[PDB]
């Protein structure tokens with residue numbers, strides 16, 4: 001046994017750390033860089049320019065670093081960056097960026113991306129996220145830390161998925177999801193907050209209550225989004241956790257001079 | 259000429275019956291057992307401990323016997339069991355069980371599992387079922403005989419799908435589906451009974467009528483589930499087919515002491 | 517050479533001189549591939565299949581496979597693909613059945629994105645876009661310039677009209693008239709694909725005529741028969757409206773009442 005299967009294809013211009021493993025019938029294309037302790041399964045296609053960090057696991061039938069088919073993209077040298085300790089399951093597609101945004105699709109650390117998920121050009125994923133089977137980010141999607149997207153969740157171009165937020169299965173998301181919020185259906189509707197998530201992060205009980213009141217201000221009291229932001233000001237100064245929620249709504253809603 | 263492609267990989271500890279066929283670039287991992295007359299296509303990944311029965315057909319890009327990514331599972335030696343005369347189409351994922359249930363994902367006989375379907379840990383499928391393209395069982399799902407799940411049907415953890423039942427396409431099922439019942443939408447709603455299915459099994463005309471009346475008792479007459487079960491008692495003693503229906507509702511609805 | 521030594525080419529396959537085939541791809545019996553086409557790695561082609569010129573087919577695609585429909589009993593049905601198509605990763609395309617025309621057919625300049633499914637006997641025109649995980653159950657006709665957003669599902673026998681547009685996660689169970697936009701599960705008509713008309717450089721008079729046509733069919737309490745009658749004037753005035761009328765016409769025979 002060697003760590004790189006003789007049946008794999010490694011481009012001369014690829015750069016692999018010493019203890020990387022690559023399974024049989026995998027392609028590591030030009031300008032792919034792979035960090036210490038990462039494991040590429042069999043039947044994987046990597047394409048560049050792509051940087052993959054340390055201790056990742058990528059499973060069979062995944063195409064990572066492919067060009068978007070968007071007719072916007074004309075063959076420019078855009079990037080894909082993946083951090084550390086990620087798991088990418090079978091059949092996942094991840095596309096590199098486009099020059100019209102930041103020229104980079106980026107993924108953080110400790111993420112779990114389950115089978116057949118799609119991560120479109122220019123998307124940005126944080127840390128500790130979970131994208132369940134067949135979740136699809138159309139492009140330019142920002143997913144902040146600890147978010148969970150249930151299976152077959154679809155996200156339109158440019159949407160922001162907030163920290164600790166949660167989508168139900170078969171959700172079709174067309175607007176930002178504020179931090180902590182749970183959404184369901186097609187089209188997606190806000191229902192509650194992800195209290196399970198807050199429990200696991202060990203939030204105080206006072207903070208959990210504050211976040212429920214915050215939900216009610218925004219969603220259950222007839223406030224416009226402007227009026228809600230004003231009402232949340234007190235509660236956001238009292239609790240770092242509520243400030244995250246206010247900040248996610250703030251940055252979603254410029255509006256127009258009326 | 260041998261029936262196992264020289265380009266395939268067969269683990270020393272795998273056990274294949276005499277006339278098994280394996281296509282090129284397929285992996286038959288450690289502790290996989292394959293029965294008489296089964297055909298593995300090209301580009302298939304089998305992983306163990308897995309037992310596959312006789313006269314199965316498994317198509318390209320399928321990963322059968324993989325570990326769930328559920329953070330619940332910590333690497334214990336769980337099983338997958340597949341029966342006889344099944345067809346598993348391209349890109350299907352089937353996961354082995356978890357110690358927290360029965361340590362076994364199990365599939366019966368004569369099933370058709372179409373492209374890109376997912377069968378989660380600890381799920382149990384009976385005989386003569388059809389899972390259409392991209393049907394997903396989240397885990398611990400029991401599918402009883404002759405069920406049909408239309409394309410892109412999603413099923414939450416722990417749901418029971420009844421015998422001869424039928425889901426429409428893009429269904430999102432969160433509670434049990436009684437036998438014979440047809441459900442549609444996200445979230446799934448009961449609509450009618452799968453009379454097409456009863457026709458194919460050659461049910462008597464008296465039994466079909468009895469099952470329609472049974473549907474009406476449970477769904478269209480303002481009965482509580484307890485009151486419906488009581489009303490069905492007569493009809494379930496008269497017809498084996500109605501007993502299947504009553505039994506599926508019975509075993510769905512312990513409830514809580516009120 | 518342009519054919520990877522790690523690929524498998526059946527003796528009975530017929531490849532034009534400058535076809536490229538990636539490693540670990542199978543070009544099965546009775547597959548024909550035209551000038552300038554590129555097959556990626558890890559592709560499975562099966563026949564009888566005819567693929568035209570300047571196509572690009574990506575990894576993990578199974579093109580020309582038999583339907584699993586229990587209707588089909590192993591007869592030699594066909595798949596035909598035209599010119600300048602792009603088929604992205606993981607796409608499945610099935611050949612036809614003897615119970616229809618024995619042929620699944622795809623035109624020119626189409627883009628079929630990852631994990632899309634094209635069921636037996638479906639017919640796709642030109643310039644269409646099927647986005648990730650779009651699924652045509654079978655016998656589906658998609659006319660020119662249609663766009664099906666991601667995870668759009670289409671029931672057997674539906675006609676998707678020219679320039680029509682489905683929103684994401686649409687579940688389509690009846691015909692979609694030309695130009696119409698539909699959304700949801702079950703799919704509902706909302707408006708017309710004006711963006712699409714802009715790109716084709718339709719006249720401004722034609723765009724207006726098509727909006728009025730939408731209103732006749734959908735927003736004025738007309739039966740479909742009454743709408744067709746009302747559209748007759750406007751369809752003679754504008755080729756673009758005739759496409760719309762014709763899509764509704766051919767959707768609605770009905771029964772003698």
Ligand SMILES: CNC(=O)CN(Cc1ccc(-n2cncn2)cc1)C(=O)CSc1ccccc1Cl
Pocket residue numbers: 130132133148149150151152169327328329330376378394395396397412413414415
């Ligand atoms: C266990 N809970 C559920 O399965 C509910 N869930 C959210 C969810 C799922 C998984 C996790 N984690 C897994 N490892 C750690 N966390 C967390 C939340 C869904 O996405 C349901 S749908 C589905 C589920 C699985 C496969 C296909 C489909 Cl379609």
Ligand SMILES: CNC(=O)CN(Cc1ccc(-n2cncn2)cc1)C(=O)CSc1ccccc1Cl
Pocket residue numbers: 388390391406407408409410427584585586587633635651652653654669670671672
């Ligand atoms: C033939 N009938 C349908 O196709 C209707 N239906 C239920 C259904 C489907 C198949 C079967 N069988 C196949 N062999 C025997 N039975 C029976 C009922 C759907 O799943 C439509 S959606 C769909 C259909 C096909 C591919 C992708 C998608 Cl998304």
Ligand SMILES: CNC(=O)CN(Cc1ccc(-n2cncn2)cc1)C(=O)CSc1ccccc1Cl
Pocket residue numbers: 069070071072118120136137138154155156157629645647648663664665666667684
């Ligand atoms: C950029 N436009 C959108 O992504 C909106 N849209 C329709 C659409 C999409 C793309 C195109 N084109 C691409 N090249 C040329 N045209 C046109 C219309 C969706 O389908 C969203 S969902 C989706 C999108 C992509 C992957 C997975 C999924 Cl789920």
